[PDB]
PDB file of C-alpha atoms in Angstrom:
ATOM      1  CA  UNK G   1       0.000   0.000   0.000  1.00 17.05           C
ATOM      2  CA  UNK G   2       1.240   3.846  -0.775  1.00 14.76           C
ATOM      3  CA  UNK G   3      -1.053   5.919   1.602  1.00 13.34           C
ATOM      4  CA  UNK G   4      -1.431   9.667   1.162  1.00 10.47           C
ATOM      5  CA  UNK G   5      -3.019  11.797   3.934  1.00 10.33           C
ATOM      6  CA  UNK G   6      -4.513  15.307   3.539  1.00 13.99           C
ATOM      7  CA  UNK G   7      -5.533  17.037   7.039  1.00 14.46           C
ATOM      8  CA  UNK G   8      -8.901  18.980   6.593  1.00 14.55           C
ATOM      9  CA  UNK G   9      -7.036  21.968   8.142  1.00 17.19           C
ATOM     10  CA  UNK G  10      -4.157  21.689   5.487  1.00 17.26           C
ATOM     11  CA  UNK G  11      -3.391  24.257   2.772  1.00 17.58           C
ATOM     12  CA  UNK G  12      -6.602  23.466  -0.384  1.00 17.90           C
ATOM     13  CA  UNK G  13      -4.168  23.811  -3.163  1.00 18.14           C
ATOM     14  CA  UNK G  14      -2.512  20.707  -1.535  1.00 17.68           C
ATOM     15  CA  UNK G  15      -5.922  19.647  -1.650  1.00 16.48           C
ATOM     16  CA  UNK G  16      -6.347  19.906  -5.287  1.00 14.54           C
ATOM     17  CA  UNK G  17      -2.563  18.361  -6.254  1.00 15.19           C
ATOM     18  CA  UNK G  18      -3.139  15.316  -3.967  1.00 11.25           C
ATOM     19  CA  UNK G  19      -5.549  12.804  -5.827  1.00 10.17           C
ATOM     20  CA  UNK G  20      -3.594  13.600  -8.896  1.00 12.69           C
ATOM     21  CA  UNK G  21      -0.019  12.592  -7.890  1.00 14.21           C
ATOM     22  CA  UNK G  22      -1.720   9.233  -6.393  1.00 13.41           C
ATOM     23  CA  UNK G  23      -2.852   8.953 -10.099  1.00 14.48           C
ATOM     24  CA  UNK G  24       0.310   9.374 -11.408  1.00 14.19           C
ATOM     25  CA  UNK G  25       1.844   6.962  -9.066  1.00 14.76           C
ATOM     26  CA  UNK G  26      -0.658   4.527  -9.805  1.00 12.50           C
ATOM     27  CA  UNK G  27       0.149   5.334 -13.325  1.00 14.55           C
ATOM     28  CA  UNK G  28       3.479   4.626 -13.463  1.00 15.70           C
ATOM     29  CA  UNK G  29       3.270   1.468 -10.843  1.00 20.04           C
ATOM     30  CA  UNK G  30       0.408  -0.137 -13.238  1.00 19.31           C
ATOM     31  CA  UNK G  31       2.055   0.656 -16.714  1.00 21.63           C
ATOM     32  CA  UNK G  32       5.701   1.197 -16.592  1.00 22.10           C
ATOM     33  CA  UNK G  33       5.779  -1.776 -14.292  1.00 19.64           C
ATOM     34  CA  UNK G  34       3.536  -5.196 -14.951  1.00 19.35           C
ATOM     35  CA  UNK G  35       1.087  -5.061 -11.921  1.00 23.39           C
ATOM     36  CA  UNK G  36      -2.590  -4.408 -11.246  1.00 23.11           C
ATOM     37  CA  UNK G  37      -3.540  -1.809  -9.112  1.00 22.98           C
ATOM     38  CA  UNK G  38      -6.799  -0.226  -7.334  1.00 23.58           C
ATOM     39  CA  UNK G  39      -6.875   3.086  -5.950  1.00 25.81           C
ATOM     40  CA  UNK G  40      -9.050   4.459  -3.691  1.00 24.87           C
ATOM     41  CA  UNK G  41     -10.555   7.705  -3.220  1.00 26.40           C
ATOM     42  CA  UNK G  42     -12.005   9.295  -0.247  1.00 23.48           C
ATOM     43  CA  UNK G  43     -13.935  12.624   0.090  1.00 23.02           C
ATOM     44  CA  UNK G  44     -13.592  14.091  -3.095  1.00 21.53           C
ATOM     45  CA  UNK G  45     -16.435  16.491  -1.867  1.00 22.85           C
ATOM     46  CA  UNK G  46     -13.255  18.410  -0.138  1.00 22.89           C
ATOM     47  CA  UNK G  47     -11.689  18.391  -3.504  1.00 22.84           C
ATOM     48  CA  UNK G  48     -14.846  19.753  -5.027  1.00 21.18           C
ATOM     49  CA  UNK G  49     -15.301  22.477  -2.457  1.00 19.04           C
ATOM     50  CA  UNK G  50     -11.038  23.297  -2.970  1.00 20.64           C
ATOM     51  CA  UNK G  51     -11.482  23.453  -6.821  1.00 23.04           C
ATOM     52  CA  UNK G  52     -14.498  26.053  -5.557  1.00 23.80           C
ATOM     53  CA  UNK G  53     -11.615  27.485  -3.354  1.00 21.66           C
ATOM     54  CA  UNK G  54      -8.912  27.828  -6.338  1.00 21.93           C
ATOM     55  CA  UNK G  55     -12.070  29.103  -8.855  1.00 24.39           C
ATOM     56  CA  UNK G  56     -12.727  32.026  -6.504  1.00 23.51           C
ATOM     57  CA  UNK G  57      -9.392  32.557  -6.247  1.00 21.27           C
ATOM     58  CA  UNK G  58      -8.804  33.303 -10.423  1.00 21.19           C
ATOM     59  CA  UNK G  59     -12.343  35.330  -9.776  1.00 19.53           C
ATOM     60  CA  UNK G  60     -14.738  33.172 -12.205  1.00 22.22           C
ATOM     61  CA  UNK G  61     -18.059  33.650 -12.623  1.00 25.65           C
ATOM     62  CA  UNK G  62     -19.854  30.641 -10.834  1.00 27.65           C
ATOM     63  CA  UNK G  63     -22.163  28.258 -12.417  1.00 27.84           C
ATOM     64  CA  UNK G  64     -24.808  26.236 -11.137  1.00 25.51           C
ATOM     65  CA  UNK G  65     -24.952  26.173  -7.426  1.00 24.77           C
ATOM     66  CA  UNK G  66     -22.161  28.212  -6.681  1.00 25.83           C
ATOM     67  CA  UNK G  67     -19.581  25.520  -8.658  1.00 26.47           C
ATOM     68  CA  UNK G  68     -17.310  26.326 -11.106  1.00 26.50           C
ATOM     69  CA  UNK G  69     -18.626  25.750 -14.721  1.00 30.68           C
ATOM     70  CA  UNK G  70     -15.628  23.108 -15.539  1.00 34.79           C
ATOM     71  CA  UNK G  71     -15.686  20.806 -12.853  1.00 32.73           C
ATOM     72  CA  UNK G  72     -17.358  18.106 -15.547  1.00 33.85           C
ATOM     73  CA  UNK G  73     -14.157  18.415 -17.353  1.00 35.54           C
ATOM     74  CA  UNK G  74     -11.863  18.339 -14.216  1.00 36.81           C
ATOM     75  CA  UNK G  75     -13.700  15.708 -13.171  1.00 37.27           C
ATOM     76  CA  UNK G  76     -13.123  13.660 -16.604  1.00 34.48           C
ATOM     77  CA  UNK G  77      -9.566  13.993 -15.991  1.00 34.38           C
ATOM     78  CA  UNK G  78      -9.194  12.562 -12.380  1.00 33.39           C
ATOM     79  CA  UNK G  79     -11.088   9.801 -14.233  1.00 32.26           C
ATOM     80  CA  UNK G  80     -11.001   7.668 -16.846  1.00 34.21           C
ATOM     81  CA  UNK G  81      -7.220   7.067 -15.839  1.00 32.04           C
ATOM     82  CA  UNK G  82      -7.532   3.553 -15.584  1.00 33.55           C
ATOM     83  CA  UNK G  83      -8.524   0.175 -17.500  1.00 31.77           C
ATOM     84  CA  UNK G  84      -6.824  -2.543 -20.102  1.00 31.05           C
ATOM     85  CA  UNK G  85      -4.543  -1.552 -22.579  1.00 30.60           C
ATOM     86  CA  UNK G  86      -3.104  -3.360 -25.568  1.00 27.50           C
ATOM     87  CA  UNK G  87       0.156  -5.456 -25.618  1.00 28.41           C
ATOM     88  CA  UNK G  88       0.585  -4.944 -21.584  1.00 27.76           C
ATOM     89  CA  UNK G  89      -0.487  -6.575 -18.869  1.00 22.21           C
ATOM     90  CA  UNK G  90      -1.417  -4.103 -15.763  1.00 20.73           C
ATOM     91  CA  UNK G  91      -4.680  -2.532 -14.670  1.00 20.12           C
ATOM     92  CA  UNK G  92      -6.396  -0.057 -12.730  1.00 17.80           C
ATOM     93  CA  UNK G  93      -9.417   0.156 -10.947  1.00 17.63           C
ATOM     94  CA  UNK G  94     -11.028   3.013  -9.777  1.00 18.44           C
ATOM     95  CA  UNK G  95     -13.648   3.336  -6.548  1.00 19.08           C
ATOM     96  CA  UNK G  96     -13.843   7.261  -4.984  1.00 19.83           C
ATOM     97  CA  UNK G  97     -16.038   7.975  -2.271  1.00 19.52           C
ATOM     98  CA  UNK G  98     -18.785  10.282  -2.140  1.00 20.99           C
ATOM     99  CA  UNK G  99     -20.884  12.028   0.229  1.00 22.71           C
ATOM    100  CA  UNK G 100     -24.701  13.507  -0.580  1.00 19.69           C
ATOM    101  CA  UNK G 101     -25.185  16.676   0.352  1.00 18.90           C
ATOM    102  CA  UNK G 102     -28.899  15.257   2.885  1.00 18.95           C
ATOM    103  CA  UNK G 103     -29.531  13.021  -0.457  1.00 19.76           C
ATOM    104  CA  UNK G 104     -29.743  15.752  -2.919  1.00 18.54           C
ATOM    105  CA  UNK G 105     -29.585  13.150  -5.743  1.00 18.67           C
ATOM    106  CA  UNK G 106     -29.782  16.085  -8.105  1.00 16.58           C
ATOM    107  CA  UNK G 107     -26.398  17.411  -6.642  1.00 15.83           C
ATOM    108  CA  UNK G 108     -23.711  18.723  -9.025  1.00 14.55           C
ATOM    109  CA  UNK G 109     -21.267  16.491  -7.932  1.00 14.06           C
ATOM    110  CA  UNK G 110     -22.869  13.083  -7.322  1.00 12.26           C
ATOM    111  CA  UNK G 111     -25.093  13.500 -10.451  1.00  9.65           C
ATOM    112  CA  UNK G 112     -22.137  14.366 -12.546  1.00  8.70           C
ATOM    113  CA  UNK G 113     -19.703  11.174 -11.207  1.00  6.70           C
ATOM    114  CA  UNK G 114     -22.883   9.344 -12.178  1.00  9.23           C
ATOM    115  CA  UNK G 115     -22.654  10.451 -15.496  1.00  9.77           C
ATOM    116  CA  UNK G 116     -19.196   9.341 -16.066  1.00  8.56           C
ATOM    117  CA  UNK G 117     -18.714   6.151 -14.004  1.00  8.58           C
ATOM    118  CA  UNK G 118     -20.338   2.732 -14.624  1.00  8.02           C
ATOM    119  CA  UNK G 119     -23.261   2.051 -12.040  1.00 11.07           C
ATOM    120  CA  UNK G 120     -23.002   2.760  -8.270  1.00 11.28           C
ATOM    121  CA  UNK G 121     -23.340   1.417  -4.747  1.00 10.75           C
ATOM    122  CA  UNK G 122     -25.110   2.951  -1.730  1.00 12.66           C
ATOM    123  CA  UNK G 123     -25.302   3.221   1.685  1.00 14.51           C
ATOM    124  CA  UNK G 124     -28.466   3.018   3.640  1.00 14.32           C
ATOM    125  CA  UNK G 125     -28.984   4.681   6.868  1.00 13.47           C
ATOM    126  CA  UNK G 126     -32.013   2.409   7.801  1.00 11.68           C
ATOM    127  CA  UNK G 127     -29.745  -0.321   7.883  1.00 10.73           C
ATOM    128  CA  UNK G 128     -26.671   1.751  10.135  1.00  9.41           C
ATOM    129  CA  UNK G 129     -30.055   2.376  12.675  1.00  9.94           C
ATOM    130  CA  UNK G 130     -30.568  -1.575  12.505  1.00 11.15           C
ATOM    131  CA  UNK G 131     -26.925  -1.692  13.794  1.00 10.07           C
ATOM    132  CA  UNK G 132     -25.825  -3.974  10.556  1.00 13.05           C
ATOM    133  CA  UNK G 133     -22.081  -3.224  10.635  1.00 12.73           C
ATOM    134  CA  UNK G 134     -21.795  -3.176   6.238  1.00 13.24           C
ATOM    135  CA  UNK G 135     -24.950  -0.324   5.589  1.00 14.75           C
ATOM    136  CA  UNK G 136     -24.519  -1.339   2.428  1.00 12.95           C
ATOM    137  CA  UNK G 137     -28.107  -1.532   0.576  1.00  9.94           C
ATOM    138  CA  UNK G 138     -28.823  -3.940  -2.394  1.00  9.29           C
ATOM    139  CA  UNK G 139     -31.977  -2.746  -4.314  1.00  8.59           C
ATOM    140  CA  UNK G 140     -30.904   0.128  -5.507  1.00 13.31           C
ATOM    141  CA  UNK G 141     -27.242  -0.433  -6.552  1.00 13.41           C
ATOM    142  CA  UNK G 142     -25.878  -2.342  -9.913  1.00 12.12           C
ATOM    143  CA  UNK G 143     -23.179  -3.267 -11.353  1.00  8.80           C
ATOM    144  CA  UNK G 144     -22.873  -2.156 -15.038  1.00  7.16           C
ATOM    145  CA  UNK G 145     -20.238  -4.823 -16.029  1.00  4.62           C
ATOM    146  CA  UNK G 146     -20.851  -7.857 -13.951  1.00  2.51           C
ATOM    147  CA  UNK G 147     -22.314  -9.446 -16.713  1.00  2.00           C
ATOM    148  CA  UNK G 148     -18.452 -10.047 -18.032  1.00  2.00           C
ATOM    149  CA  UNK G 149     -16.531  -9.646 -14.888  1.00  2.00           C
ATOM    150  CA  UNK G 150     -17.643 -13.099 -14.424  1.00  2.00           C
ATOM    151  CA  UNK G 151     -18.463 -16.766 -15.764  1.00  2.00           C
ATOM    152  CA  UNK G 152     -17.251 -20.258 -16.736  1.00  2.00           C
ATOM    153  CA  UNK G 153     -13.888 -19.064 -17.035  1.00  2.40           C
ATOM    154  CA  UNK G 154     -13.830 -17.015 -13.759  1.00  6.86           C
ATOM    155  CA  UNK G 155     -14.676 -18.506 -10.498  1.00  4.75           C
ATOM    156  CA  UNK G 156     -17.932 -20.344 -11.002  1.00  3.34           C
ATOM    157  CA  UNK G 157     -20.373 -21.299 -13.924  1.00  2.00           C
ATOM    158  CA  UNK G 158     -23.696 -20.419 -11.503  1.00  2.00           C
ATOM    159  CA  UNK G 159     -22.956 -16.916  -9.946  1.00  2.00           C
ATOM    160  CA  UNK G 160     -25.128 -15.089 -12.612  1.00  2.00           C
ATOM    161  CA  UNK G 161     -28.333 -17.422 -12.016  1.00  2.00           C
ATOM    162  CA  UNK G 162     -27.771 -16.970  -8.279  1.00  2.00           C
ATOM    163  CA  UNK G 163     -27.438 -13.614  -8.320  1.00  2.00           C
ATOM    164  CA  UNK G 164     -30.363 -12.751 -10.494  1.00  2.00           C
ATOM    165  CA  UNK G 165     -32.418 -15.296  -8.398  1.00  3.25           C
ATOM    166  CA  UNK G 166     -31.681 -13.786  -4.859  1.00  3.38           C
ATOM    167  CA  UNK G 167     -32.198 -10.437  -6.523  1.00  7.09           C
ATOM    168  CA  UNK G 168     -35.441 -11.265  -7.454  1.00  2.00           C
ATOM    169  CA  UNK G 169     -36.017 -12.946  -3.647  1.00  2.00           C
ATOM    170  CA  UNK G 170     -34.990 -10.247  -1.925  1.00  2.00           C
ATOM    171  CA  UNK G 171     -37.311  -7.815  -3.884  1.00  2.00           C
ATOM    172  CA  UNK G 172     -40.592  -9.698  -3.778  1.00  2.00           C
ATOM    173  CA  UNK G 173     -39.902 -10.513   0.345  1.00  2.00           C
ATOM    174  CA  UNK G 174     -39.355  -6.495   0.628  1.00  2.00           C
ATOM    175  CA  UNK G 175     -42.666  -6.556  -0.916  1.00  2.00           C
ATOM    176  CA  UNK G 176     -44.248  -9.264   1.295  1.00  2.00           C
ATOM    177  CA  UNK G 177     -42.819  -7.512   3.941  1.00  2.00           C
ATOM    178  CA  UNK G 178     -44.984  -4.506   3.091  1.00  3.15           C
ATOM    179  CA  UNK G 179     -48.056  -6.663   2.644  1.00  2.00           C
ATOM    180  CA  UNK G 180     -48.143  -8.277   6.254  1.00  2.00           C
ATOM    181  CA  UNK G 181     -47.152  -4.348   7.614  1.00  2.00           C
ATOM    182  CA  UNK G 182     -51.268  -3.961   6.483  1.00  2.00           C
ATOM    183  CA  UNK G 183     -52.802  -7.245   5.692  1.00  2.00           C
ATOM    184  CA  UNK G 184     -51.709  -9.400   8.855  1.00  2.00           C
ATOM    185  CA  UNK G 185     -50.179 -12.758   9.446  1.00  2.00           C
ATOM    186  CA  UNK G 186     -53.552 -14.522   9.502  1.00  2.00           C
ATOM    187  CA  UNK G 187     -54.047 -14.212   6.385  1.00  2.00           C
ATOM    188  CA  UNK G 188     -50.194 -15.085   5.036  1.00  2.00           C
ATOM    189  CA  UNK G 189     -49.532 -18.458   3.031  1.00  2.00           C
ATOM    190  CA  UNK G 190     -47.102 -20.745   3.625  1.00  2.00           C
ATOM    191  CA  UNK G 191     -44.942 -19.638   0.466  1.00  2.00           C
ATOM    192  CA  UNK G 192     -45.466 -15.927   1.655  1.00  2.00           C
ATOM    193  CA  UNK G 193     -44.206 -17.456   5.080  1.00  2.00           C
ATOM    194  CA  UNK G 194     -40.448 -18.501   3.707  1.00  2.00           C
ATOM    195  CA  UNK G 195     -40.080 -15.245   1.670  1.00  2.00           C
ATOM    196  CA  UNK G 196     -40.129 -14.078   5.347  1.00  2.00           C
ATOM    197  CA  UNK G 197     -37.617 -16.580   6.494  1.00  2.00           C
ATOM    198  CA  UNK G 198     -35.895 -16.058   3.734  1.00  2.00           C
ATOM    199  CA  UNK G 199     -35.686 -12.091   4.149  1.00  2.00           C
ATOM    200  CA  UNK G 200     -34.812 -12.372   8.054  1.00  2.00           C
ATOM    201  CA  UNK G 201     -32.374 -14.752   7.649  1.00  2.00           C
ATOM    202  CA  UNK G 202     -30.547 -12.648   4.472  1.00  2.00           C
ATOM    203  CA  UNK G 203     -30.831 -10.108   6.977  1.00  2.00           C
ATOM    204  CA  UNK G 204     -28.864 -11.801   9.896  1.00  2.00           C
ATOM    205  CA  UNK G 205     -26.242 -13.645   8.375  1.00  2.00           C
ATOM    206  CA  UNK G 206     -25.492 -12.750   5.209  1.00  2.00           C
ATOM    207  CA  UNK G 207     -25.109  -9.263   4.615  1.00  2.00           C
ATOM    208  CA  UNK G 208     -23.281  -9.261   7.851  1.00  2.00           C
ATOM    209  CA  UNK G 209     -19.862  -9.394   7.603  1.00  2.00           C
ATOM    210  CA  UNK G 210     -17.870  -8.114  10.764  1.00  2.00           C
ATOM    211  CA  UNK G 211     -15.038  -5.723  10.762  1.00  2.00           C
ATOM    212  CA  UNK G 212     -12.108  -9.117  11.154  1.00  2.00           C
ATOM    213  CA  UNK G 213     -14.287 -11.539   8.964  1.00  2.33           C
ATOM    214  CA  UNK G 214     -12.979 -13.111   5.340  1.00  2.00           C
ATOM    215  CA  UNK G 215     -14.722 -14.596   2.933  1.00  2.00           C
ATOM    216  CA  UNK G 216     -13.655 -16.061  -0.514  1.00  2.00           C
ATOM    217  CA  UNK G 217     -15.722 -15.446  -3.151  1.00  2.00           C
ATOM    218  CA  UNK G 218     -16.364 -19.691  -3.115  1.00  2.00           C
ATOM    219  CA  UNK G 219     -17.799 -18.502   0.399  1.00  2.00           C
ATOM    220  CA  UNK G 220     -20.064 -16.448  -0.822  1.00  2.84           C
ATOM    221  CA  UNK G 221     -21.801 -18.699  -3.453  1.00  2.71           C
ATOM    222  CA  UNK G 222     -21.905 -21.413  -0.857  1.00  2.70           C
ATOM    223  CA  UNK G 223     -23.875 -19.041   1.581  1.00  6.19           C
ATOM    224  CA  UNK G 224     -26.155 -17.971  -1.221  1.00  4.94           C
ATOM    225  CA  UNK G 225     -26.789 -21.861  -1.997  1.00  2.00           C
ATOM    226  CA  UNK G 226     -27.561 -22.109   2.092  1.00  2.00           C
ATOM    227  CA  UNK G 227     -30.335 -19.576   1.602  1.00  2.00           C
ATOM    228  CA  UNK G 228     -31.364 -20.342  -2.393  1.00  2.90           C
ATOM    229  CA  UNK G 229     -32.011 -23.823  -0.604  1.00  2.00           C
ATOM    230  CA  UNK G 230     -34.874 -23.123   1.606  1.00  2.00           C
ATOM    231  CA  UNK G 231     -37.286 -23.018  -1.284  1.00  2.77           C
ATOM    232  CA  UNK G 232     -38.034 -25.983  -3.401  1.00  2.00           C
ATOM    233  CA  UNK G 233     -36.145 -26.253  -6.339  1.00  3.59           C
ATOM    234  CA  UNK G 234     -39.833 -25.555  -8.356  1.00  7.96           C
ATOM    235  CA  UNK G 235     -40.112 -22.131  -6.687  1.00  5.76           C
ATOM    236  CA  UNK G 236     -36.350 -20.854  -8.443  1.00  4.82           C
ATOM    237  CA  UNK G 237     -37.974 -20.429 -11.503  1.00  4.49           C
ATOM    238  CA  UNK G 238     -35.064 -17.759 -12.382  1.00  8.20           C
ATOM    239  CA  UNK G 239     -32.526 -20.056 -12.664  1.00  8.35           C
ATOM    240  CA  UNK G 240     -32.127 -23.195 -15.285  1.00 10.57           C
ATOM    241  CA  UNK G 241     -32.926 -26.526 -13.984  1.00  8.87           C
ATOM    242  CA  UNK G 242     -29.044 -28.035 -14.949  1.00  9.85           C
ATOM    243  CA  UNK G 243     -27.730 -25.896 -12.090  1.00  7.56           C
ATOM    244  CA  UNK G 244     -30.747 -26.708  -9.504  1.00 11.58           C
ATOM    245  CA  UNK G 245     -29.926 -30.666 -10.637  1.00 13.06           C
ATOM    246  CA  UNK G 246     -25.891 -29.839  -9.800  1.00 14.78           C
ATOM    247  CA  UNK G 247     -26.153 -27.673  -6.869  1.00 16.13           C
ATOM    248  CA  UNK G 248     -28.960 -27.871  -4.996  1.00 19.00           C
ATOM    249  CA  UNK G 249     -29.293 -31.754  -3.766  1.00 16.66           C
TER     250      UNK G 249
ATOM    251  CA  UNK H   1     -60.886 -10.614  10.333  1.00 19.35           C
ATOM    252  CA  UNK H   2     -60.008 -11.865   7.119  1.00 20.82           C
ATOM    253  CA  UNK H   3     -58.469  -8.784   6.831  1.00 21.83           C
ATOM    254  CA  UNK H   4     -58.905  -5.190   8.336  1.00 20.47           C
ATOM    255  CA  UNK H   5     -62.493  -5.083   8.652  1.00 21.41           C
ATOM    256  CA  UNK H   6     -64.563  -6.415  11.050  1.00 20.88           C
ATOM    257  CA  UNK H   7     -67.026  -9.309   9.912  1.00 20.72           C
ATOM    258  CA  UNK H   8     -70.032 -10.575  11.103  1.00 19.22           C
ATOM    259  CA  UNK H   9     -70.551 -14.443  11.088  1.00 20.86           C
ATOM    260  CA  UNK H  10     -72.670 -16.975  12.387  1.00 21.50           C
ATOM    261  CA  UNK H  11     -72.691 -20.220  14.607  1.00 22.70           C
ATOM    262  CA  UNK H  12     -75.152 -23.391  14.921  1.00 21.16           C
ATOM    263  CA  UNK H  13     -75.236 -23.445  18.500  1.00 19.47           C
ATOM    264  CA  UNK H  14     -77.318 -26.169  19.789  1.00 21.40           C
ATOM    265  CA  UNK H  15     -79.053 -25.421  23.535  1.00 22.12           C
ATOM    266  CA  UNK H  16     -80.329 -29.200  23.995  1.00 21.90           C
ATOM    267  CA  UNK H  17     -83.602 -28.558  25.130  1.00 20.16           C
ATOM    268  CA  UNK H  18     -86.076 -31.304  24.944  1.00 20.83           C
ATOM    269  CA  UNK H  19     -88.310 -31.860  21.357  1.00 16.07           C
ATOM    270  CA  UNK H  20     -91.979 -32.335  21.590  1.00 13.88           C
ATOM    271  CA  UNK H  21     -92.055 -35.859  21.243  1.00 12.50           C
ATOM    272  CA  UNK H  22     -95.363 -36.796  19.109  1.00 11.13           C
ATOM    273  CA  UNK H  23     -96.535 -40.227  19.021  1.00 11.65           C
ATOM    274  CA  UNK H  24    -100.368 -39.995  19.671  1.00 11.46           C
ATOM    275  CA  UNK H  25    -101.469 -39.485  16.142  1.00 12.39           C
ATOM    276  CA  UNK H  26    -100.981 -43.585  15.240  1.00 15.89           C
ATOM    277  CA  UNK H  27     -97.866 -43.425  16.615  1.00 14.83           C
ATOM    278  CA  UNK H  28     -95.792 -41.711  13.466  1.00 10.85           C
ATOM    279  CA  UNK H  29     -92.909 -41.218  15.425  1.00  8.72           C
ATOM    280  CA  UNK H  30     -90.910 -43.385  13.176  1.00  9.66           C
ATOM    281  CA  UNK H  31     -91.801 -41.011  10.283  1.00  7.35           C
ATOM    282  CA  UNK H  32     -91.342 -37.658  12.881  1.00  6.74           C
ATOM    283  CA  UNK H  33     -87.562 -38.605  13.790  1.00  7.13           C
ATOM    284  CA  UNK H  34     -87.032 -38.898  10.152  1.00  9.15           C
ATOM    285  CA  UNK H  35     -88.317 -35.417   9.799  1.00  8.95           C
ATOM    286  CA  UNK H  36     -86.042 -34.342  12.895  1.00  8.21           C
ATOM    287  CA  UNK H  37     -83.154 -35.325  11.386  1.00  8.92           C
ATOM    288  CA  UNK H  38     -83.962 -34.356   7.749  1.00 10.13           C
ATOM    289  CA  UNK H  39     -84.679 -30.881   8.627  1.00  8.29           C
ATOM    290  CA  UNK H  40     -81.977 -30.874  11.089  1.00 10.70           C
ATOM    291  CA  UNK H  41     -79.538 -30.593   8.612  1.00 12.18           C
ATOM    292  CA  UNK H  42     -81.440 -27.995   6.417  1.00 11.32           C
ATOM    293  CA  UNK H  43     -81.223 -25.951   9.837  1.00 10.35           C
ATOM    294  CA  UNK H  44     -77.561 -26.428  10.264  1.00  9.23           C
ATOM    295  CA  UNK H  45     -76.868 -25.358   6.009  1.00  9.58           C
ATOM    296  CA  UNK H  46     -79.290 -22.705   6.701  1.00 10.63           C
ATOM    297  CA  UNK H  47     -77.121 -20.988   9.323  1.00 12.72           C
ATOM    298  CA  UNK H  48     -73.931 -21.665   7.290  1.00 13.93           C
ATOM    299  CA  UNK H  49     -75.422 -19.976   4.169  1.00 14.59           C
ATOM    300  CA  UNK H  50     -76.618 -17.001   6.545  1.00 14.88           C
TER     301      UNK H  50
END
């Protein structure tokens, strides 16, 4: 690991060089030399409100919301410095940090990343209240490129089926969850009964993880077999019946 | 409450207190506890379908 550290009460044009001299050293480590590499990036609201510092400074005209005009192109060029290239070997993943200014989804800033990156994760606060140590939410978020980033060739033929299939549980048991909040348990069937299960359980083991806990990805898919197996195998209609006939006995 | 209203529904409660016994009438009782238990069970559907 190369760590950088910039104090809040530090100069901003610090600020502003910062993020891009981790670039370039990720750069250079990544192409120059054959290695992979992912870089993280935390509060780049600070570096938004320091390019608002150094925009004052030149005395620009601001834009929308007090911004400067050209933070979409500023903001293309901390980006977009990483992926495959041909004849080498490296790579570079990118995952910055945001923070919503009391979930203005319209924001500037989170609106804009959102225009230039490839799908998005979020963070629910219902679920920090529920003391669940990852807050990390699942209906909303996506992953534009999982559809590649895995298959035969990567860890495991069935991921896509399970995924899509526990997708599809987990929305319909929100739902179900919503239906007994009004309709009552008396009148619940037994099917309605393990989406229930099936949502509680989710709930208290798997999206858990614990701040010293490690899982392998092979992990993972067996946990998601542990709770695809509560149903019958009838009831997955999302996923083909070769993988039920594999996996699920 | 099948659901969040309130319902009104019915039971065949049966008190047990004693028929009039007829047998005067050339003693027909054979053909009267026929009749009790064929209308019985009329009674009992009735207060279902009510």
């Amino acid at each position: 690991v190369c760590l950088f550290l910039n104090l809040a009460n530090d100069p901003t044009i610090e600020r502003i060089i910062t993020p891009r001299l981790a670039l370039t050293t990720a750069e250079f480590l990544a192409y120059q030399c054959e290695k992979h590499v992912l870089v993280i990036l935390t509060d780049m609201s600070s570096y938004a409100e320091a390019l608002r510092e150094v925009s004052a400074a030149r005395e620009e005209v601001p834009g929308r919301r007090g911004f400067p005009g050209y933070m979409y192109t500023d903001l293309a060029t901390i980006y977009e410095r990483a992926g495959r290239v041909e004849g080498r070997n490296g790579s570079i993943t990118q995952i910055p940090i945001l923070t919503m200014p009391n979930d203005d989804i319209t924001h500037p800033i989170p609106d804009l990343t959102g225009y230039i990156t490839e799908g998005q994760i979020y963070v629910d606060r219902q679920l920090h209240n529920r003391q669940i140590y990852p807050p990390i939410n699942v209906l909303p978020s996506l992953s534009r490129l999982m559809k590649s980033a895995i298959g035969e060739g990567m860890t495991r033929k069935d991921h896509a089926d399970v995924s899509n299939q526990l997708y599809a549980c987990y929305a319909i048991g929100k739902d179900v969850q919503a239906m007994k909040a009004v309709v009552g348990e008396e009148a619940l069937t037994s099917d309605d009964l393990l989406y229930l299960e099936f949502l509680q359980k989710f709930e208290k083991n798997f999206i858990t993880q614990g701040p010293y806990e490690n899982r392998t990805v092979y992990e993972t898919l067996d946990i998601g077999w542990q709770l695809l197996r509560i149903f019958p195998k009838e009831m997955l209609k999302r996923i083909p019946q070769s993988t039920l006939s594999e996996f699920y006995p | 409450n099948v659901a969040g209203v309130t319902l009104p529904v019915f039971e065949h409660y049966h008190e047990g207190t004693d028929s009039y016994e007829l047998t005067g009438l050339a003693r027909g009782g054979e053909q009267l506890a026929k009749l009790k238990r064929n209308y019985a069970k009329a009674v009992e559907l009735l207060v279902e379908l009510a």
